[PDB]
Amino acid sequence: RSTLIDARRSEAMTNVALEMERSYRQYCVLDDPTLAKVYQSQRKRYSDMLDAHAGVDKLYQALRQDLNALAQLQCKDSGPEAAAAARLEAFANANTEMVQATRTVVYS
């Protein structure tokens, strides 16, 4: 079932995930509504790829929850809120796990 198109998608998801965290920390510094729109656009782009990544589970469910928990931008003293920052970190590690898991199933 899984082809390298699913591998390219895991690539692109982690790329958008880091772009999400970049926009999040940029927004908390500058407090600009346009950056918020970009962040939700990137979050929406990640959501769409996760849907296309359905199948290919535990790791899938956790990625969807982190995506939902990151829906609102909470800032505190020019940085993300502590709970928001912990979610961003967890979301990035689940994405790393997703790349590993995806790459084993596309070739074994």
Numbering used by the authors: 49 to 104, 108 to 159
Direct quotes from the study:
Here, we report that the outer membrane lipoprotein QseG functions as an accessory protein that directly binds to and activates the histidine kinase QseE via its C-terminal domain. QseEF, a TCS responsive to multiple ligands including phosphate, sulfate, adrenaline, and AI-3, is essential for the virulence of pathogenic Enterobacteriaceae. Notably, genomic analyses reveal that a third gene qseG is co-transcribed with qseE and qseF, encoding an outer membrane lipoprotein anchored to the inner leaflet via N-terminal lipid modification.
To refine atomic modeling, we additionally determined the crystal structures of QseG37-221 at 2.1 Å and the QseE sensor domain at 2.4 Å resolution. Although the sensor domain of QseE is not annotated in InterPro, we observed that the QseE sensor adopts a four-helix bundle (4HB) structure. The QseE sensor domain consists of extended helices arranged in parallel and anti-parallel orientations, characteristic of the 4HB family. Conserved arginine residues are critical for recognizing small signaling molecules, a hallmark of 4HB family sensors such as NarX and McpN. Consistent with these observations, QseE contains two conserved arginine residues (R70 and R73) that may participate in QseG recognition. This result is consistent with our structural observations and sequence alignment analysis, which revealed that R70 and R73 are located at the interaction interface with QseG and are highly conserved across species, whereas R154 lacks both of these features. QseE38-171 represents the periplasmic sensor domain, whereas QseE1-196 includes both transmembrane regions and the sensor domain. Cross-linking experiments showed that QseE38-171 exists as a monomer in solution, whereas QseE1-196 and full-length QseE form dimers.
